[PDB]
Amino acid sequence: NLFGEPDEGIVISRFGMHADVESADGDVHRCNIRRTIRSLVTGDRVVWRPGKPAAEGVNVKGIVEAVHERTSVLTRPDFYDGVKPIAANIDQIVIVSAILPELSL
RNA sequence: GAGGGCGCUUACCACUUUGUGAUUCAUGACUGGGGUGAAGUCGUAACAAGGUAACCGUAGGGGAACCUGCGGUUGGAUCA
Ligand SMILES: [Mg+2]
Ligand SMILES: [Mg+2]
Ligand SMILES: [Mg+2]
């Protein structure tokens, strides 16, 4: 509770109970998520509020309220897990492989 | 003179010093796991004969669930 400014920022990573949200200038600021969010992926622009600092300058987390629309999505299903998106909102993928241990086709 | 006091010395002994032990708390780089986590990734182990029957004990293997070897049990299906 006692949230801050609703703004647009880029989510750095996903950690289940919380997420890392980069602001509009390059500030690593970890936040938790809203209960009604169906999914949150790496690199998804969101609407979020950075809580409120309890100590002056020292805050713990904020919240991520809403999720914008998807440009792309990477949905891959799995046995006994269902269809799960991995990453989203991307224009180019680079398939990276190595000759070790194997190079399959 | 007898005797006493003072003073000195000795025995006992508190505090105090060194050497070196046992025990206890606080601090403590680092490090060993374990628990609590609905949505995170990795796999599909077990529960049906759960798709190589499972499990216990022991040795080895490898991100991991686990696997194989030896022996035991039915807390196993199908049974003749
Ligand atoms: Mg299995
Ligand atoms: Mg089995
Ligand atoms: Mg056996």
Swiss-Prot record:
Disruption phenotype: Reduced growth rate, reduced 70S ribosomes, accumulation of 17S rRNA (the precursor of 16S rRNA). Ribosomal proteins uS2 and bS21 not found in 30S subunits, decreased uS3 and RbfA in 30S subunits, distortion of rRNA helix 44 near the decoding center. The phenotype is partially suppressed by overexpression of a number of genes involved in ribosome function, including infB, era and ksgA. Double rbfA-rsgA deletion mutants have the same phenotype as single mutants. It is found in: Cytoplasm. Residues 1-80 are annotated as: Necessary for association with the ribosome and for stimulation of GTPase activity by 30S ribosomes. It comes from the Bacteria. One of at least 4 proteins (Era, RbfA, RimM and RsgA/YjeQ) that assist in the late maturation steps of the functional core of the 30S ribosomal subunit. Binds the 30S subunit contacting the head, platform, and rRNA helix 44, which may assist the last maturation stages. Removes RbfA from mature, but not immature 30S ribosomes in a GTP-dependent manner; 95% removal in the presence of GTP, 90% removal in GMP-PNP and 65% removal in the presence of GDP. Circulary permuted GTPase that catalyzes rapid hydrolysis of GTP with a slow catalytic turnover. Monomer. All of the protein is associated with ribosomes; the ratio is substoichiometric at 1:200 RsgA/ribosome. Association is tightest with the 30S subunit in the presence of the non-hydrolyzable GTP analog GMP-PNP. 2 cryoelectron microscopy (cryo-EM) structures in complex with 30S ribosomes have been resolved; the protein is determined to bind to different but partially overlapping regions of the 30S ribosomal subunit. One cryo-EM study suggests it contacts ribosomal proteins uS3, uS12 and uS13 as well as 16S rRNA. Has 3 domains; an N-terminal OB-like domain (about residues 1-100), a central, circularly permutated GTPase module (residues 104-270) and the C-terminal zinc-finger domain (residues 280 to 350). The C-terminal domain has 2 regions; the zinc-binding domain (residues 287-319) is required for binding to 30S ribosomes while the extreme C-terminus (residues 320-350) helps remove RbfA from the mature 30S subunit. Belongs to the TRAFAC class YlqF/YawG GTPase family. RsgA subfamily. This is Small ribosomal subunit biogenesis GTPase RsgA. The chain holds residues 34 to 138 of 350 of the full protein.
